[PDB]
């Protein structure tokens, strides 16, 4: 393999207590003799699924729970095997955050939520609303300082305000989340994002302020407030700023609803040291001495282990985190969160800068959030419709116009290049699905380069329909839907940003109308 046997390599983000975790590994090396190396790579959430799909990466990966469900869908995680004797040591909600398809995929560590952090010496009475912030900024700017400065490069810090008046990611009726209704461009988010953009335009905040310059500004006493979670308390302690942690401001009478994260530890499915990773996580990290080693470095918040939470509950700063946690909503861990996160990440940055209006950014975020879902429905319906000859009798008329347009456009194009399609077809293996799934390699390489227009996308889907028909004739019916999956993977992973600029499939409908 590509992972060394006899040691543990752990990936944890840089804002967390990576040193405090490293001394847990020194303790792990001292009783055990096995070395434990902890690293904090940048863009960890994106680099793990890339290197783990090729069978490499760390033994243990640390991040909030929202990313693990996608990693599990991609088969990058091994099921953790804790007995109930151990499960009774952590709170049930932490276990609930690491469940996907009924199988546990990671050990929960600690519950995070954003809070308002304010300098008691620059204002001893924190404002209870967001609407009070512009006026307070004018008074302190006369004193040479600012009211609020928080990171606007990651949408995690703005979602509390966006979700205040009715914004949400994916709706949770009836048993669980539904994928079709995304709430990024509702009247609530348009109002929440507008107040932030209005704060930027009236020069009360800077649109490209990030994490480091906002933390430095607060630690120096250059701002009266900012928004971050428990991991920032450590360096505010060192700056000796008399700070407080209180509940986030309300927006339009409603509380700010922060995304609740549960940082968790998953075990790589390609790792040869899965049992030692379990022993390290069960009998060393998730113990009171082990968690205190990490919490002393950078605070975790509400620890998952019940014995250590009973000791740390008395902290007024952790109590404030639960106030914001209860008034927030838990982040889903469905595999569609990555595409949702990138959609809102671009939308906040473009609206903050003025490159897009708030309405243009949020609608494009809606297209990007449902991008993969709606694309697969149209391509899967079309390939089935060309294979059977009938029609499916299953916020849907837009797909009906796209499928009817794809019927009219795909039929003519498919018979235009019909000779070339069969010459390309003439070969064909099609022995198993692994070979049909192996068409992902060829298609992504040919499609990353070259012209991007609707004509190419139609030609891509039309040959897929051409293969689907032949799949039905060679009695390979079950291979049609996996073929559609492959086409949808290739299409969106290469042309996502183009398809968003073209109104999603609405631009496909108008292009041919
Ligand atoms: C208030 C509290 C929080 C806490 O915290 C321990 C850390 C984990 C935690 C729990 N709770 C949380 C809530 C939270 C709250 C609050 N309301 N709502 C709607 C949510 C989502 C939020 Cl917002 C954030 C974190 C938690 C839910 C209730 C208590 N509990 C739970 C605790 C137990 C138990 O007694 O062992 C059994 C539980 C749950 C949840 C389901 N079951 C079966 C949890 O597992 C720990 C304690 C002791 C107490 Cl008294
Ligand atoms: C529509 C269709 C597509 C298609 O193709 C199957 C999909 C991918 C495919 C492969 N090869 C291709 C070459 C190719 C060849 C030959 N030489 N060179 C220089 C290239 C670029 C061309 Cl020109 C076009 C497509 C492919 C590369 C070598 C073999 N192989 C590979 C094969 C193996 C393996 O079996 O061991 C491992 C491989 C690769 C590529 C990377 N790895 C690890 C492929 O994955 C095949 C047919 C019959 C049809 Cl009908
Ligand atoms: C393995 C697999 C692959 C796949 O891939 C679908 C990708 C679409 C594709 C293209 N081409 C194809 C040819 C083809 C060949 C070879 N010769 N000739 C004459 C044709 C028509 C065949 Cl036989 C089948 C599919 C294609 C080459 C020319 C058109 N073109 C195009 C390429 C360019 C460009 O390079 O810039 C611009 C183009 C077009 C078409 C319009 N414009 C503007 C393409 O991108 C789909 C599936 C389901 C599977 Cl399973
Ligand atoms: O901003 C999008 C980003 O939000 C969350 O990332 C948080 C992380 O969970 C926190 O523990 C801390 O590291 O701050 C991050 C934001 O900078 C999600 O976990 C992540 O998936 C998403 O991309």
Q: Are residues 368 and 223 in the same domain?
A: no
| Beta strands in 198-286, from DSSP E residues, in sequence order | 223-228, 243-246, 250-251, 254-255, 259-267
For ligand 2, say whether the CB of 428 is within 6 Å of any of its atoms: yes
Q: Are residues 356 and 455 in the same domain?
A: yes
Beta bridge partners of 10: 38, 60
Q: Are residues 241 and 125 in the same domain?
A: yes
Q: Name the residue among 266, 354, 314 with its Cα closest to residue 59.
A: 266
Q: Which helix (H) or strand (E) holds 303?
A: strand 302-303
Technique used to solve these coordinates = X-ray
DSSP track, 183-211: ESSSHHHHHHHHHHHHHHHTTSS-TT--H
Q: In angstroms, how far is CA 442 from the centroid of its own chain?
A: 28
> Alpha helices of 114-184 — where are they, by DSSP H?
133-142, 159-162
CA 289/CA 308 separation, integer angstroms: 9
Cβ atoms 172, 228 nearer than 8 A: no
Q: Which helix (H) or strand (E) holds 116?
A: strand 115-119
Cβ atoms 415, 428 nearer than 8 A: no
* Resolution in Å, one decimal place: 2.7
Q: Is 224 helix (H, G, I), strand (E, B) or coil?
A: strand
In the 8-state DSSP scheme, what is residue 156? G
Q: Is 353 exposed, middle or buried (0-12, 13-18, 19+ CB in 10 A)?
A: middle
CA 301/CA 313 separation, integer angstroms: 9
Distance 460 CA to ligand 3 centre (A): 6
Q: Which two tokens mark 470? A: 């032949």
For ligand 4, say whether the CB of 67 is within 6 Å of any of its atoms: yes
Ligand number with the minimum distance to the CA of 70: 4
Distance 419 CA to ligand 3 centre (A): 13
Mutate to test the pocket of ligand 2, among 442, 447, 464, 470 (most ligand atoms within 8 A of CB): 442
DSSP track, 72-111: HHTT-BPPP---HHHHTTB-HHHHHTTEETTEE-EEEEEE
CA 223/CA 208 separation, integer angstroms: 16
CA 444/CA 464 separation, integer angstroms: 14
Q: Are residues 237 and 361 in the same domain?
A: no
Q: Compute the chain's Rg from CA coordinates.
A: 25
CA 329/CA 348 separation, integer angstroms: 20
Q: Name the residue among 477, 1, 4, 10 with its Cα closest to residue 277.
A: 10
Look-up of token digits 């050990």: 107
Mutate to test the pocket of ligand 1, among 93, 291, 302 (most ligand atoms within 8 A of CB): 93
CA 336/CA 184 separation, integer angstroms: 14
Angle at 219 between CA 215 and CA 224, to 5 degrees: 90
Q: Which two tokens mark 403? A: 């499928």
Mutate to test the pocket of ligand 3, among 455, 456, 470 (most ligand atoms within 8 A of CB): 456
Q: Name the residue among 153, 199, 495 with its Cα closest to residue 350.
A: 153
Mutate to test the pocket of ligand 1, among 84, 87, 90, 91 (most ligand atoms within 8 A of CB): 91
CA 512/CA 155 separation, integer angstroms: 36
Q: Are residues 233 and 367 in the same domain?
A: no
- Which atom number of ligand 1 is nearest to the Cα of residue 328? 23
Cβ atoms 321, 258 nearer than 8 A: no
Q: Are residues 253 and 378 in the same domain?
A: no
State which residues form the domain around 210: 115-259
Q: How far is CA 60 from CA 21, 182, 273, 324, in A?
A: 12, 32, 10, 29
Look-up of token digits 């428990």: 230
Q: Is 165 helix (H, G, I), strand (E, B) or coil?
A: coil
Q: Are residues 252 and 140 in the same domain?
A: yes
Q: Which helix (H) or strand (E) holds 388?
A: helix 371-388
For ligand 4, say whether the CB of 377 is within 6 Å of any of its atoms: no
Q: Name the residue among 139, 252, 145 with its Cα closest to residue 193.
A: 252
Q: How far is CA 444 from CA 181, 330, 494, in A?
A: 29, 35, 7
- How many C-beta neighbours within 10 Å does residue 399 have? 17
For ligand 4, say whether the CB of 73 is within 6 Å of any of its atoms: no
Cβ atoms 380, 487 nearer than 8 A: no
- How many C-beta neighbours within 10 Å does residue 367 have? 23
DSSP track, 19-32: HHHHHHHHHHHHHH
Q: Is 173 helix (H, G, I), strand (E, B) or coil?
A: coil
- CATH number for the domain spanning 356: value is 1.10.437.10
- How many C-beta neighbours within 10 Å does residue 375 have? 25
Q: Are strands 182-183 and 115-119 parallel, antiparallel or unpaired?
A: unpaired
CA 36/CA 316 separation, integer angstroms: 34
Q: What are phi and psi of 492, to 5 degrees?
A: -85, -30
Q: Are residues 255 and 348 in the same domain?
A: no
| Beta strands in 238-283, from DSSP E residues, in sequence order | 243-246, 250-251, 254-255, 259-267
- Which atom number of ligand 3 is nearest to the Cα of residue 467? 48
For ligand 4, say whether the CB of 112 is within 6 Å of any of its atoms: yes
Q: Between 439-448 and 480-501, two packed helices, what is the crossing angle to 10 degrees?
A: 20
Q: Are residues 499 and 361 in the same domain?
A: yes
- Which atom number of ligand 3 is nearest to the Cα of residue 447? 45
- Which atom number of ligand 1 is nearest to the Cα of residue 309? 6
- CATH number for the domain spanning 253: value is 3.40.190.10
Q: Are residues 360 and 454 in the same domain?
A: yes
CA 375/CA 509 separation, integer angstroms: 13
Q: Report the half-sphere exposure of 232 (CA within 13 A, side-chain side).
A: 26
CA 146/CA 341 separation, integer angstroms: 29
Beta bridge partners of 112: 261
CA 165/CA 157 separation, integer angstroms: 16
Spell out which residues line ligand 1, taking CB within 6 angstroms. Answer: 91-94, 111, 260, 302, 309, 322, 325-326
Look-up of token digits 């010496």: 121
Q: Are residues 470 and 341 in the same domain?
A: yes
Q: After which residues does the chain show a gap where C to N exceeds 2.5 Å?
A: 394
Q: Is 449 helix (H, G, I), strand (E, B) or coil?
A: coil
Beta bridge partners of 305: 90
Distance 459 CA to ligand 3 centre (A): 6
Distance 233 CA to ligand 4 centre (A): 17
- How many C-beta neighbours within 10 Å does residue 482 have? 12
CA 506/CA 430 separation, integer angstroms: 34
Peptide bond into 213 cis (omega under 30): no
Report the C-alpha dihedral over residues 119, 123, 124, 130, rounded to 10 degrees. Answer: -90
Distance 156 CA to ligand 4 centre (A): 6
Name 45's Cβ contacts closer than 8 Å, sequence gap at least 6: 63, 67
DSSP track, 330-370: EPP--TTHHHHHHHHHHHHHHHHHTSS-HHHHHHHHHHHHS
Q: Are residues 401 and 487 in the same domain?
A: yes
Q: Name the residue among 154, 346, 365 with its Cα closest to residue 261.
A: 154
Q: Is 144 exposed, middle or buried (0-12, 13-18, 19+ CB in 10 A)?
A: exposed
Integer distance in angstroms from the first to the last C-alpha of the chain?
54
């Amino acid at each position: 393999g590509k992972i060394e046997e006899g040691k543990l390599v752990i990936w944890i983000n840089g804002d967390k207590g990576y040193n405090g975790l490293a001394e847990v590994g020194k303790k792990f090396e001292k009783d055990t003799g096995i070395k434990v190396t902890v690293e904090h790579p940048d863009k960890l959430e994106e680099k793990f699924p890339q290197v783990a799909a090729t069978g490499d990466g760390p033994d243990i990966i640390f991040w909030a729970h929202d990313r693990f469900g996608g990693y599990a869908q991609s088969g990058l995680l091994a099921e953790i095997t804790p007995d109930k004797a151990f499960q009774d040591k952590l709170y049930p909600f932490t276990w609930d955050a690491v469940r996907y398809n009924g199988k546990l995929i990671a050990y929960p560590i600690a519950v995070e939520a954003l809070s308002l952090i304010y300098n008691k010496d620059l204002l001893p009475n924190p404002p209870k609303t967001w609407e009070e912030i512009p006026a307070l900024d004018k008074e302190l700017k006369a004193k040479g300082k600012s009211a609020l400065m928080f990171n606007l490069q990651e949408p995690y810090f703005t979602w509390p305000l966006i979700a205040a008046d009715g914004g949400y990611a994916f709706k949770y009726e009836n048993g669980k989340y539904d994928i079709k209704d995304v709430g990024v461009d509702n009247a609530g988010a348009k109002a929440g994002l507008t107040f932030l953009v209005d704060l930027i335009k009236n020069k009360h905040m800077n649109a490209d302020t990030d994490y480091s310059i906002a933390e430095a500004a607060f630690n120096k006493g250059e701002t009266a407030m900012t928004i971050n979670g428990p991991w920032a308390w450590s360096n505010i302690d060192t700056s000796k700023v008399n700070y407080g942690v209180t509940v986030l401001p309300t927006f339009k009478g409603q509380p700010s609803k922060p995304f609740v994260g549960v940082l968790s530890a998953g075990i790589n499915a390609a790792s040869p040291n899965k049992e030692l990773a379990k022993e390290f996580l069960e009998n060393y990290l998730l113990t009171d001495e082990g968690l205190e080693a990490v919490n002393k470095d950078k605070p975790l918040g509400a620890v998952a282990l019940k014995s250590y939470e009973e000791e740390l509950a008395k902290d007024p700063r952790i109590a404030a985190t639960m106030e914001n946690a209860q008034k927030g909503e838990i982040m889903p861990n469905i595999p569609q969160m990555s595409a949702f996160w990138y959609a809102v990440r671009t939308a906040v940055i473009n609206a903050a800068s003025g490159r897009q209006t708030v309405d243009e950014a949020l609608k494009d975020a809606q297209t990007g959030s449902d991008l993969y879902r709606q694309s697969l429905e149209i391509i899967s319906r079309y390939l089935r419709e060309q294979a059977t000859g009938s029609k499916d009798s299953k916020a849907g008329a837009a797909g009906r116009r796209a499928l009817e347009t794809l019927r009219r456009v795909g039929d003519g194009v498919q018979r235009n290049h019909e000779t070339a399609f069969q010459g390309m077809l003439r070969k064909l293996d099609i022995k198993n699905e692994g070979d049909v799934k192996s068409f992902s390699r060829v298609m992504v390489h040919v499609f990353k380069d070259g012209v991007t227009n609707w004509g190419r996308i139609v030609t891509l889907i039309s040959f897929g329909a051409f293969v689907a028909k032949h799949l039905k004739s060679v009695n390979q019916e079950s291979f049609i839907e996996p073929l559609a999956e492959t086409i949808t993977d290739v299409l969106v992973r290469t042309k996502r940003d183009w398809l968003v600029k073209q109104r999603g499939w609405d631009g496909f409908v108008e292009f041919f109308h």
